[PDB]
């Protein structure tokens, strides 16, 4: 649908966009429709989508199977409350999630958004120790991590990124080990592994859980680390009895080349958070799974229950489109498509590493990252990308690609070629 | 869609429902479809819905205008990212919200769920004072209130209800004035008003905002208080420069008899949170509106922006069905329908007040509350209600009704008659 000149001014003057200023917002672009792997602007220009609307749209846009599953569930009921009620979409979705996740995970808590799913996992960890009579209130994690924007999640986000300086006096105080990415190109710094274990052993009676994003640290820097980290952290947790929360809201459903990034290490978390691509990026839904032991334990405390329940919990429409999205993944095609994207990204982004504006090129699965030596000029780059017929949304010192799995070769070539051109243009960087 | 015997056992064994135990959950009922004001169970029994799926389904179920608006937007695009992008559903929705809300409210932050909308409002208040160079980290509120389940919202929830005893060591410490409901039937206790003002004046340099649910306190007790509270709190805030956050996630869009419960007092908050009935209860969406002064101020600090941005922010599908829901309210019929429901609830619930199991009957708008002297036996009552052909979900000491605005007379009579019968049956109460 059409937008007037006055509509676009009203948006600028009244409508917040993610992490924007209301006094001096950068321009936005008017999208009318989306089809396959393309966004369609007012006036008809089509942009190849390089971002999958931030991870989630792994099957692209206007997918006929996802559309049909939504309209079918609307005909039955788009929503009914989940208190004292169950329904077929939630049951099928939770069957599918239990069946496809690492083996100890048996119990599913459906929720609205990724941030809430993390809050839920944190609350579960705290109720777990409360049922066991211990006062454990601290979470141990990596630097460079990202877990959401609500206050609980913010307290495990990296203490320089989320500007903790402003909320530190309000935000709960957690434990932050060295970032896992090696300091100079190696697989991992054993020193960083030893330093993680020292922090854990030093606070082992205060730590409720370790929380981390497995293999890829997303919004905190698109950083990629070795799976030895996960096998070793899993062993440490097992030795202490501490819970392991895996935040796969970004990595889940195939994007790093395995269905769940935990599979890279062959470990199972005690609590697993999912979101984003769960619905094929059609609408918001999240899920937090736990082991039987965790769920029974948090059923044993003085709570009598797990103390959480969103109004739209179990929403039939979102469950029904998540089911159709998961059914698309059951073809198994994603695993091959993602491997071929990975190989093309590695080959076509390599020339960028020669640029003086570029500090690193790194690829895993269908994630291609060009880390720059200076912050990007977002407005100038966005205009350039749109002029080239593509949609790429950089931030900070990162120009990165996470396209839909069904992207065609020439569409992906247009993305990598645009990125290579962008890093040669000094005007596209700030100071 | 159909559920097998084995599906229902899998739900019991694997699927959390709101505030449930995984070890001893109460039974749930299998819903296949919903139409008009009725839920349809497996096997075909139809239940009159007394709850509107917890506030939100004000137009009932399977509404043809809401269905058509969803399918139309699916054909265009169900979702695209909002970072650097705008679209027609978000613009129309934000135009409608600005136009219909109290006059200073001009800027709209769209989000995923009610809890996140509250977190957003709290973050806005904190960034506001940070931009003004003051360290204000405390929130002042009423006892008996409810604002959501994430950690930030939990810290303004009533300190006995949400079991703060478990999170108090993790949860931020806020200020809690006497509950507003009068102690013995009057309109208000001036002493409680004086005590609120003393707490504010005693901490006036630490208080970032007052947050409250206007007129009706929902999950914290379905309590109803006089509008003099709002006019006086608004005056106090104005005198100190303190922000007023109105949480209308439950009261917004007509349920208390006015479009927004703030209109009962004729006051405007600095920040207004909306949710639930926003989409007609078809799927989750929230919105937090602010004044121009707040938005520019939180654009002035060291942040450079408002530090929040959900992945599905601005979701076109949810915006499009919220637009259709708001267009239904533009008929103005809701205001008359709600007044007639109020009058029927008052007349038909009055006999319940004679019961020894009952402590109070209170009605406002399309909300009818029977407060009991002992906690309900939820399992036994739920079975009774379903046997009577209705859906009523009590909790604690509350049996209450919040039906869709389009409920028919005989449907509402069946609800009130079931409630009257339930409070005469000692078996339906626990110890």
PDB file of C-alpha atoms in Angstrom, chain A residues 1-4 6-8 10-11 13-23 27-34 39 51 53-54 56 61-62 67 70-71 74-88 90-91 94-95 98 106-109 112-113 116 119 122-124 126-127 130 137 139 149-152 154-155 162-163 166-167 169-170 172 174 276 279 281-284 288 290 292 295-296 298-299 302 304-313 315 317 391 393, chain B residues 1-4 6-8 10-11 13-23 27-34 39 51 53-54 56 61-62 67 70-71 74-88 90-91 94-95 98 106-109 112-113 116 119 122-124 126-127 130 137 139 149-152 154-155 162-163 166-167 169-170 172 174 276 279 281-284 288 290 292 295-296 298-299 302 304-313 315 317 391 393:
ATOM      1  CA  UNK A   1       0.000   0.000   0.000  1.00  0.00           C
ATOM      2  CA  UNK A   2       0.679   3.529  -1.150  1.00  0.00           C
ATOM      3  CA  UNK A   3       2.337   6.242   0.993  1.00  0.00           C
ATOM      4  CA  UNK A   4       1.785   9.966   0.361  1.00  0.00           C
ATOM      5  CA  UNK A   6       2.581  13.683   3.832  1.00  0.00           C
ATOM      6  CA  UNK A   7       2.585  10.073   5.178  1.00  0.00           C
ATOM      7  CA  UNK A   8       6.419   9.952   4.881  1.00  0.00           C
ATOM      8  CA  UNK A  10       4.411  12.000   9.460  1.00  0.00           C
ATOM      9  CA  UNK A  11       6.608   8.918   9.841  1.00  0.00           C
ATOM     10  CA  UNK A  13       8.034  13.389  12.713  1.00  0.00           C
ATOM     11  CA  UNK A  14       6.075  10.870  14.843  1.00  0.00           C
ATOM     12  CA  UNK A  15       7.294   7.258  14.422  1.00  0.00           C
ATOM     13  CA  UNK A  16      10.314   5.778  16.214  1.00  0.00           C
ATOM     14  CA  UNK A  17      12.381   3.238  14.283  1.00  0.00           C
ATOM     15  CA  UNK A  18      14.893   0.857  15.959  1.00  0.00           C
ATOM     16  CA  UNK A  19      17.572   2.780  17.881  1.00  0.00           C
ATOM     17  CA  UNK A  20      16.698   6.115  16.301  1.00  0.00           C
ATOM     18  CA  UNK A  21      16.573   9.701  17.349  1.00  0.00           C
ATOM     19  CA  UNK A  22      13.307  11.540  17.143  1.00  0.00           C
ATOM     20  CA  UNK A  23      15.085  14.839  16.673  1.00  0.00           C
ATOM     21  CA  UNK A  27      15.953   8.776   6.202  1.00  0.00           C
ATOM     22  CA  UNK A  28      13.946   5.595   5.791  1.00  0.00           C
ATOM     23  CA  UNK A  29      12.766   3.945   2.596  1.00  0.00           C
ATOM     24  CA  UNK A  30       9.072   3.297   1.750  1.00  0.00           C
ATOM     25  CA  UNK A  31       8.384  -0.429   1.173  1.00  0.00           C
ATOM     26  CA  UNK A  32       5.017  -1.423  -0.371  1.00  0.00           C
ATOM     27  CA  UNK A  33       5.438  -5.199  -0.870  1.00  0.00           C
ATOM     28  CA  UNK A  34       7.922  -8.029  -0.692  1.00  0.00           C
ATOM     29  CA  UNK A  39      11.661  -5.754  -1.336  1.00  0.00           C
ATOM     30  CA  UNK A  51      19.465  -9.021   5.605  1.00  0.00           C
ATOM     31  CA  UNK A  53      14.807  -8.657   7.947  1.00  0.00           C
ATOM     32  CA  UNK A  54      17.506  -9.309  10.545  1.00  0.00           C
ATOM     33  CA  UNK A  56      14.347 -14.195  10.446  1.00  0.00           C
ATOM     34  CA  UNK A  61       8.958 -13.112   1.463  1.00  0.00           C
ATOM     35  CA  UNK A  62       5.402 -13.868   0.427  1.00  0.00           C
ATOM     36  CA  UNK A  67       0.832 -17.585   3.271  1.00  0.00           C
ATOM     37  CA  UNK A  70      -1.578 -18.375   7.883  1.00  0.00           C
ATOM     38  CA  UNK A  71      -4.862 -17.969   6.003  1.00  0.00           C
ATOM     39  CA  UNK A  74      -7.132 -17.427  10.438  1.00  0.00           C
ATOM     40  CA  UNK A  75     -10.213 -19.285   9.164  1.00  0.00           C
ATOM     41  CA  UNK A  76     -10.151 -21.548  12.277  1.00  0.00           C
ATOM     42  CA  UNK A  77      -9.092 -18.868  14.874  1.00  0.00           C
ATOM     43  CA  UNK A  78      -6.203 -16.387  14.798  1.00  0.00           C
ATOM     44  CA  UNK A  79      -6.044 -16.283  18.590  1.00  0.00           C
ATOM     45  CA  UNK A  80      -7.472 -17.788  21.788  1.00  0.00           C
ATOM     46  CA  UNK A  81      -6.017 -17.551  25.343  1.00  0.00           C
ATOM     47  CA  UNK A  82      -3.757 -20.415  26.522  1.00  0.00           C
ATOM     48  CA  UNK A  83      -4.817 -20.315  30.176  1.00  0.00           C
ATOM     49  CA  UNK A  84      -6.781 -23.584  30.714  1.00  0.00           C
ATOM     50  CA  UNK A  85      -6.847 -24.182  26.923  1.00  0.00           C
ATOM     51  CA  UNK A  86      -4.715 -25.975  24.346  1.00  0.00           C
ATOM     52  CA  UNK A  87      -4.953 -26.161  20.531  1.00  0.00           C
ATOM     53  CA  UNK A  88      -3.556 -28.021  17.548  1.00  0.00           C
ATOM     54  CA  UNK A  90       0.724 -25.163  19.711  1.00  0.00           C
ATOM     55  CA  UNK A  91       0.811 -28.964  20.083  1.00  0.00           C
ATOM     56  CA  UNK A  94       5.986 -28.090  20.514  1.00  0.00           C
ATOM     57  CA  UNK A  95       6.174 -31.666  19.145  1.00  0.00           C
ATOM     58  CA  UNK A  98      11.173 -31.235  21.088  1.00  0.00           C
ATOM     59  CA  UNK A 106      11.728 -31.834  26.655  1.00  0.00           C
ATOM     60  CA  UNK A 107       9.594 -28.934  27.961  1.00  0.00           C
ATOM     61  CA  UNK A 108       8.567 -25.889  25.910  1.00  0.00           C
ATOM     62  CA  UNK A 109       7.571 -22.421  27.148  1.00  0.00           C
ATOM     63  CA  UNK A 112       6.109 -13.475  22.302  1.00  0.00           C
ATOM     64  CA  UNK A 113       9.596 -12.203  21.449  1.00  0.00           C
ATOM     65  CA  UNK A 116      11.057 -12.231  26.677  1.00  0.00           C
ATOM     66  CA  UNK A 119      13.974 -13.237  30.486  1.00  0.00           C
ATOM     67  CA  UNK A 122      16.903 -16.302  33.345  1.00  0.00           C
ATOM     68  CA  UNK A 123      13.822 -16.562  35.609  1.00  0.00           C
ATOM     69  CA  UNK A 124      13.902 -20.347  35.183  1.00  0.00           C
ATOM     70  CA  UNK A 126      16.774 -18.312  39.311  1.00  0.00           C
ATOM     71  CA  UNK A 127      13.701 -20.377  40.293  1.00  0.00           C
ATOM     72  CA  UNK A 130      15.433 -21.221  44.784  1.00  0.00           C
ATOM     73  CA  UNK A 137      21.524 -14.636  41.536  1.00  0.00           C
ATOM     74  CA  UNK A 139      24.888 -15.022  35.505  1.00  0.00           C
ATOM     75  CA  UNK A 149      16.650  -4.929  25.151  1.00  0.00           C
ATOM     76  CA  UNK A 150      14.537  -5.593  28.248  1.00  0.00           C
ATOM     77  CA  UNK A 151      16.240  -4.896  31.616  1.00  0.00           C
ATOM     78  CA  UNK A 152      16.959  -8.553  32.532  1.00  0.00           C
ATOM     79  CA  UNK A 154      20.353  -5.975  29.135  1.00  0.00           C
ATOM     80  CA  UNK A 155      22.207  -7.142  32.285  1.00  0.00           C
ATOM     81  CA  UNK A 162      24.536  -1.452  25.642  1.00  0.00           C
ATOM     82  CA  UNK A 163      25.960   1.698  27.371  1.00  0.00           C
ATOM     83  CA  UNK A 166      23.513   4.619  32.237  1.00  0.00           C
ATOM     84  CA  UNK A 167      21.722   1.510  33.603  1.00  0.00           C
ATOM     85  CA  UNK A 169      23.070   1.766  38.823  1.00  0.00           C
ATOM     86  CA  UNK A 170      19.710   0.154  37.976  1.00  0.00           C
ATOM     87  CA  UNK A 172      21.824  -6.257  38.087  1.00  0.00           C
ATOM     88  CA  UNK A 174      26.745 -10.064  36.411  1.00  0.00           C
ATOM     89  CA  UNK A 276      13.355 -14.902  14.720  1.00  0.00           C
ATOM     90  CA  UNK A 279       8.079 -18.204  12.118  1.00  0.00           C
ATOM     91  CA  UNK A 281      10.166 -14.065   9.806  1.00  0.00           C
ATOM     92  CA  UNK A 282       6.421 -13.501   9.233  1.00  0.00           C
ATOM     93  CA  UNK A 283       5.459 -12.330  12.742  1.00  0.00           C
ATOM     94  CA  UNK A 284       6.871 -12.496  16.244  1.00  0.00           C
ATOM     95  CA  UNK A 288      12.347 -21.422  25.610  1.00  0.00           C
ATOM     96  CA  UNK A 290      14.287 -26.909  29.121  1.00  0.00           C
ATOM     97  CA  UNK A 292      12.791 -32.381  32.465  1.00  0.00           C
ATOM     98  CA  UNK A 295      11.059 -28.036  34.682  1.00  0.00           C
ATOM     99  CA  UNK A 296      10.346 -30.344  37.676  1.00  0.00           C
ATOM    100  CA  UNK A 298      11.084 -25.055  39.086  1.00  0.00           C
ATOM    101  CA  UNK A 299       7.817 -26.844  39.822  1.00  0.00           C
ATOM    102  CA  UNK A 302       7.797 -22.032  46.936  1.00  0.00           C
ATOM    103  CA  UNK A 304       4.256 -23.794  42.907  1.00  0.00           C
ATOM    104  CA  UNK A 305       4.586 -22.997  39.187  1.00  0.00           C
ATOM    105  CA  UNK A 306       6.814 -21.213  36.721  1.00  0.00           C
ATOM    106  CA  UNK A 307       6.021 -17.496  37.356  1.00  0.00           C
ATOM    107  CA  UNK A 308       5.493 -16.233  33.782  1.00  0.00           C
ATOM    108  CA  UNK A 309       2.622 -16.009  31.261  1.00  0.00           C
ATOM    109  CA  UNK A 310       2.275 -13.548  28.310  1.00  0.00           C
ATOM    110  CA  UNK A 311      -1.386 -12.677  27.272  1.00  0.00           C
ATOM    111  CA  UNK A 312      -0.767 -13.898  23.664  1.00  0.00           C
ATOM    112  CA  UNK A 313       1.117 -17.010  24.820  1.00  0.00           C
ATOM    113  CA  UNK A 315      -0.906 -17.641  19.728  1.00  0.00           C
ATOM    114  CA  UNK A 317      -1.663 -17.994  14.121  1.00  0.00           C
ATOM    115  CA  UNK A 391      19.087  -3.876   0.768  1.00  0.00           C
ATOM    116  CA  UNK A 393      21.774  -2.392   6.621  1.00  0.00           C
TER     117      UNK A 393
ATOM    118  CA  UNK B   1      -7.869 -28.688  13.890  1.00  0.00           C
ATOM    119  CA  UNK B   2      -8.231 -32.081  15.502  1.00  0.00           C
ATOM    120  CA  UNK B   3      -6.290 -33.244  18.597  1.00  0.00           C
ATOM    121  CA  UNK B   4      -5.660 -36.934  19.345  1.00  0.00           C
ATOM    122  CA  UNK B   6      -1.947 -38.711  22.436  1.00  0.00           C
ATOM    123  CA  UNK B   7      -1.702 -34.994  21.451  1.00  0.00           C
ATOM    124  CA  UNK B   8      -3.508 -34.000  24.699  1.00  0.00           C
ATOM    125  CA  UNK B  10       1.852 -34.605  25.000  1.00  0.00           C
ATOM    126  CA  UNK B  11       0.518 -31.152  25.875  1.00  0.00           C
ATOM    127  CA  UNK B  13       3.651 -33.661  29.638  1.00  0.00           C
ATOM    128  CA  UNK B  14       5.644 -31.127  27.558  1.00  0.00           C
ATOM    129  CA  UNK B  15       3.851 -27.762  27.144  1.00  0.00           C
ATOM    130  CA  UNK B  16       3.852 -24.982  29.749  1.00  0.00           C
ATOM    131  CA  UNK B  17       0.673 -22.920  30.062  1.00  0.00           C
ATOM    132  CA  UNK B  18       0.538 -19.516  31.846  1.00  0.00           C
ATOM    133  CA  UNK B  19       1.675 -19.797  35.478  1.00  0.00           C
ATOM    134  CA  UNK B  20       1.497 -23.584  35.527  1.00  0.00           C
ATOM    135  CA  UNK B  21       3.405 -26.403  37.073  1.00  0.00           C
ATOM    136  CA  UNK B  22       4.991 -28.966  34.834  1.00  0.00           C
ATOM    137  CA  UNK B  23       4.734 -31.609  37.519  1.00  0.00           C
ATOM    138  CA  UNK B  27      -6.414 -29.971  33.027  1.00  0.00           C
ATOM    139  CA  UNK B  28      -6.812 -27.826  29.936  1.00  0.00           C
ATOM    140  CA  UNK B  29      -9.592 -27.880  27.368  1.00  0.00           C
ATOM    141  CA  UNK B  30      -9.049 -28.588  23.628  1.00  0.00           C
ATOM    142  CA  UNK B  31     -10.257 -25.678  21.446  1.00  0.00           C
ATOM    143  CA  UNK B  32     -10.548 -26.258  17.666  1.00  0.00           C
ATOM    144  CA  UNK B  33     -12.136 -22.985  16.464  1.00  0.00           C
ATOM    145  CA  UNK B  34     -13.698 -19.757  17.630  1.00  0.00           C
ATOM    146  CA  UNK B  39     -15.148 -21.048  21.605  1.00  0.00           C
ATOM    147  CA  UNK B  51     -12.963 -13.482  29.203  1.00  0.00           C
ATOM    148  CA  UNK B  53      -8.967 -14.130  25.899  1.00  0.00           C
ATOM    149  CA  UNK B  54      -7.913 -11.862  28.763  1.00  0.00           C
ATOM    150  CA  UNK B  56      -8.025  -8.385  24.099  1.00  0.00           C
ATOM    151  CA  UNK B  61     -13.532 -14.157  17.223  1.00  0.00           C
ATOM    152  CA  UNK B  62     -13.239 -14.806  13.511  1.00  0.00           C
ATOM    153  CA  UNK B  67      -9.898 -11.618   8.878  1.00  0.00           C
ATOM    154  CA  UNK B  70      -5.089  -9.795   7.758  1.00  0.00           C
ATOM    155  CA  UNK B  71      -5.344 -11.725   4.487  1.00  0.00           C
ATOM    156  CA  UNK B  74      -0.398 -11.115   3.945  1.00  0.00           C
ATOM    157  CA  UNK B  75      -0.789 -10.752   0.166  1.00  0.00           C
ATOM    158  CA  UNK B  76       1.340  -7.545   0.242  1.00  0.00           C
ATOM    159  CA  UNK B  77       3.908  -8.664   2.925  1.00  0.00           C
ATOM    160  CA  UNK B  78       3.347 -10.142   6.390  1.00  0.00           C
ATOM    161  CA  UNK B  79       6.653  -8.756   7.640  1.00  0.00           C
ATOM    162  CA  UNK B  80       9.643  -6.579   6.716  1.00  0.00           C
ATOM    163  CA  UNK B  81      12.262  -5.061   9.092  1.00  0.00           C
ATOM    164  CA  UNK B  82      11.663  -1.483  10.329  1.00  0.00           C
ATOM    165  CA  UNK B  83      15.327  -0.462  10.466  1.00  0.00           C
ATOM    166  CA  UNK B  84      15.724   2.132   7.648  1.00  0.00           C
ATOM    167  CA  UNK B  85      12.254   1.208   6.292  1.00  0.00           C
ATOM    168  CA  UNK B  86       8.676   2.379   6.762  1.00  0.00           C
ATOM    169  CA  UNK B  87       5.359   1.035   5.405  1.00  0.00           C
ATOM    170  CA  UNK B  88       1.694   1.919   5.087  1.00  0.00           C
ATOM    171  CA  UNK B  90       2.656   1.317  10.554  1.00  0.00           C
ATOM    172  CA  UNK B  91       1.959   4.855   9.293  1.00  0.00           C
ATOM    173  CA  UNK B  94       0.524   5.592  14.307  1.00  0.00           C
ATOM    174  CA  UNK B  95      -1.688   8.296  12.729  1.00  0.00           C
ATOM    175  CA  UNK B  98      -1.836   9.952  17.846  1.00  0.00           C
ATOM    176  CA  UNK B 106       2.694  12.740  19.681  1.00  0.00           C
ATOM    177  CA  UNK B 107       5.442  10.105  19.269  1.00  0.00           C
ATOM    178  CA  UNK B 108       4.834   6.356  18.940  1.00  0.00           C
ATOM    179  CA  UNK B 109       7.222   3.487  19.727  1.00  0.00           C
ATOM    180  CA  UNK B 112       5.859  -6.675  20.463  1.00  0.00           C
ATOM    181  CA  UNK B 113       4.063  -7.219  23.777  1.00  0.00           C
ATOM    182  CA  UNK B 116       8.085  -4.830  26.530  1.00  0.00           C
ATOM    183  CA  UNK B 119      10.028  -1.733  29.795  1.00  0.00           C
ATOM    184  CA  UNK B 122      10.593   2.835  32.021  1.00  0.00           C
ATOM    185  CA  UNK B 123      13.736   3.123  29.848  1.00  0.00           C
ATOM    186  CA  UNK B 124      12.343   6.343  28.362  1.00  0.00           C
ATOM    187  CA  UNK B 126      15.377   6.849  32.830  1.00  0.00           C
ATOM    188  CA  UNK B 127      16.917   8.255  29.618  1.00  0.00           C
ATOM    189  CA  UNK B 130      19.971  11.159  32.092  1.00  0.00           C
ATOM    190  CA  UNK B 137      16.420   5.667  39.038  1.00  0.00           C
ATOM    191  CA  UNK B 139       9.679   4.599  40.152  1.00  0.00           C
ATOM    192  CA  UNK B 149       6.436 -10.435  33.796  1.00  0.00           C
ATOM    193  CA  UNK B 150       9.826  -9.222  32.558  1.00  0.00           C
ATOM    194  CA  UNK B 151      12.303  -8.119  35.274  1.00  0.00           C
ATOM    195  CA  UNK B 152      11.874  -4.338  34.780  1.00  0.00           C
ATOM    196  CA  UNK B 154       8.213  -7.031  37.788  1.00  0.00           C
ATOM    197  CA  UNK B 155       9.952  -4.317  39.868  1.00  0.00           C
ATOM    198  CA  UNK B 162       4.662 -11.281  42.202  1.00  0.00           C
ATOM    199  CA  UNK B 163       6.445 -13.051  45.141  1.00  0.00           C
ATOM    200  CA  UNK B 166      12.459 -14.437  45.467  1.00  0.00           C
ATOM    201  CA  UNK B 167      13.560 -11.625  43.095  1.00  0.00           C
ATOM    202  CA  UNK B 169      17.694  -9.522  45.854  1.00  0.00           C
ATOM    203  CA  UNK B 170      17.854  -9.287  42.044  1.00  0.00           C
ATOM    204  CA  UNK B 172      15.446  -3.002  41.506  1.00  0.00           C
ATOM    205  CA  UNK B 174      11.036   1.025  43.924  1.00  0.00           C
ATOM    206  CA  UNK B 276      -4.053  -6.395  24.164  1.00  0.00           C
ATOM    207  CA  UNK B 279      -5.123  -5.824  17.528  1.00  0.00           C
ATOM    208  CA  UNK B 281      -6.906  -9.832  20.283  1.00  0.00           C
ATOM    209  CA  UNK B 282      -5.786 -11.527  17.036  1.00  0.00           C
ATOM    210  CA  UNK B 283      -2.010 -11.486  17.624  1.00  0.00           C
ATOM    211  CA  UNK B 284       0.475  -9.643  19.794  1.00  0.00           C
ATOM    212  CA  UNK B 288       4.241   3.261  23.880  1.00  0.00           C
ATOM    213  CA  UNK B 290       5.140   9.970  24.500  1.00  0.00           C
ATOM    214  CA  UNK B 292       7.251  15.706  22.051  1.00  0.00           C
ATOM    215  CA  UNK B 295      11.020  12.238  22.799  1.00  0.00           C
ATOM    216  CA  UNK B 296      13.338  15.237  22.142  1.00  0.00           C
ATOM    217  CA  UNK B 298      15.667  11.269  25.196  1.00  0.00           C
ATOM    218  CA  UNK B 299      17.139  12.284  21.847  1.00  0.00           C
ATOM    219  CA  UNK B 302      24.669  10.705  25.664  1.00  0.00           C
ATOM    220  CA  UNK B 304      22.057   9.818  20.737  1.00  0.00           C
ATOM    221  CA  UNK B 305      18.857   7.786  20.280  1.00  0.00           C
ATOM    222  CA  UNK B 306      16.270   5.848  22.222  1.00  0.00           C
ATOM    223  CA  UNK B 307      18.111   2.581  23.112  1.00  0.00           C
ATOM    224  CA  UNK B 308      15.499  -0.033  22.117  1.00  0.00           C
ATOM    225  CA  UNK B 309      14.469  -1.936  18.960  1.00  0.00           C
ATOM    226  CA  UNK B 310      12.647  -5.330  18.754  1.00  0.00           C
ATOM    227  CA  UNK B 311      13.404  -7.451  15.565  1.00  0.00           C
ATOM    228  CA  UNK B 312       9.662  -7.574  14.628  1.00  0.00           C
ATOM    229  CA  UNK B 313       9.127  -3.881  15.435  1.00  0.00           C
ATOM    230  CA  UNK B 315       5.274  -5.780  11.975  1.00  0.00           C
ATOM    231  CA  UNK B 317       0.540  -7.790   9.590  1.00  0.00           C
ATOM    232  CA  UNK B 391     -15.736 -19.983  29.455  1.00  0.00           C
ATOM    233  CA  UNK B 393     -11.252 -18.380  34.039  1.00  0.00           C
TER     234      UNK B 393
END
